[PDB]
Amino acid sequence: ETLGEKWKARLNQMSALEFYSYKKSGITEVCREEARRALKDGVATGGHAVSRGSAKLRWLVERGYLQPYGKVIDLGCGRGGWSYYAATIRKVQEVKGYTKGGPGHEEPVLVQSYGWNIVRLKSGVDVFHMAAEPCDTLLCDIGESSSSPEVEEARTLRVLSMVGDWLEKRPGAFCIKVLCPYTSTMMETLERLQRRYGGGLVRVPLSRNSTHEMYWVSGAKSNTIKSVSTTSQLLLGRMDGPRRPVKYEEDVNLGSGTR
Ligand SMILES: C[n+]1cn([C@@H]2O[C@H](COP(=O)(O)OP(=O)(O)OP(=O)(O)OC[C@H]3O[C@@H](n4cnc5c(N)ncnc54)[C@H](O)[C@@H]3O)[C@@H](O)[C@H]2O)c2nc(N)[nH]c(=O)c21
Ligand SMILES: C[S@@+](CC[C@H](N)C(=O)[O-])C[C@H]1O[C@@H](n2cnc3c(N)ncnc32)[C@H](O)[C@@H]1O
């Protein structure tokens, strides 16, 4: 049993109150409420992000873990946070997002942030039932949580299988959600994939403690085992002391206009 698995076990064993305190203990959070007021008022200007995702991707870019450029594919784009953020980057020329939509799933949001005209979000698409196509930047944020670490592992594995085909067209720059990187098989498969395609795992502090999600990005390079175990150490450590205050931040502004 690995540290992450012990973390998952401890997590599931927690009482609901303890879990409420723990999920956001000491994490970085972005203020979103003005963005929700504006978005539900139908304000397409003002440069509001459609989701929290834009803050995540930003965190990865501003620290040089990936450098988006050219044609960007966003698998599981959802509302389009990653896509709309990617549209604001200089070297990025075109952004194409794909999401499942329908019952239980997010629909694409139309907004006129900077570079909205080079963005196209397609809904009603199963990326698993979709032929891969060439791209400079490969983004993927698929990985639904589960109380069962085995289910999370299986879903993550299916995701990696799916993104293999896109990666063999060889970008470039990529960022891929790894929901469950804390099992033995997962870490070994990630070692393999890291030797084949490069890149490394990175924990984003905007992530909640209730998820062990890490991001496989091209501009990172690190021992998978060590970074995963470091993350696990952080999450484990945050279960013992008092509740650490939330570090609130300003949400990313994506401006307005076309390109
Ligand atoms: C609500 N919840 C979630 N988790 C754990 O957190 C992980 C990720 O959770 P999340 O990041 O999706 O966000 P959160 O759960 O806070 O809210 P959301 O609505 O997004 O998640 C709902 C999911 O939580 C899970 N869940 C609900 N109640 C419990 C519970 N009593 N024990 C374990 N898992 C639960 C269900 O699978 C459900 O699909 C889950 O895989 C689960 O093991 C919990 N653990 C305890 N001990 N008590 C909880 O109440 C709890
Ligand atoms: C939570 S989102 C990511 C957030 C998004 N990047 C943003 O910044 O707004 C992940 C999305 O992937 C979508 N998804 C899950 N499985 C999918 C599949 N098989 N095909 C297409 N989209 C899927 C879900 O609907 C979900 O909205």
Write up this protein.
It comes from Zika virus. S-adenosyl-L-methionine binds at residues 51, 81-82, 99-100, 126-127, 215. Prevents premature fusion activity of envelope proteins in trans-Golgi by binding to envelope protein E at pH 6.0. After virion release in extracellular space, gets dissociated from E dimers. Residues 1-259 form the MRNA cap 0-1 NS5-type MT domain. It is found in: Host cytoplasm, Host perinuclear region; Host endoplasmic reticulum membrane; Host nucleus; Secreted. By secondary structure, the chain is an alpha/beta fold. The protein has a single domain (1-259), classed as 3-Layer(aba) Sandwich (Rossmann fold), CATH 3.40.50.150. It contains eight helices and nine strands. The chain has helices spanning 3-13, 16-22, 33-40, 53-61, 81-86, 149-167, 184-197, 224-237, and strands at residues 28-30, 70-75, 92-98, 119-122, 137-140, 173-178, 200-202, 214-217, 247-249. A seven-stranded mixed sheet has the order 4-3-2-5-6-8-7. It has a two-stranded parallel sheet with strand order 1-9. Strand 2, helix 5 (81-86) and strand 3 form a beta-alpha-beta unit. Helix 1 (3-13) runs parallel beside helix 8. 38% of the residues are buried. The protein binds P1-7-methylguanosine-P3-adenosine-5',5'-triphosphate and S-adenosylmethionine. P1-7-methylguanosine-P3-adenosine-5',5'-triphosphate is lined by residues 11-12, 14, 16, 19, 23, 145-147, 208, 210-211.
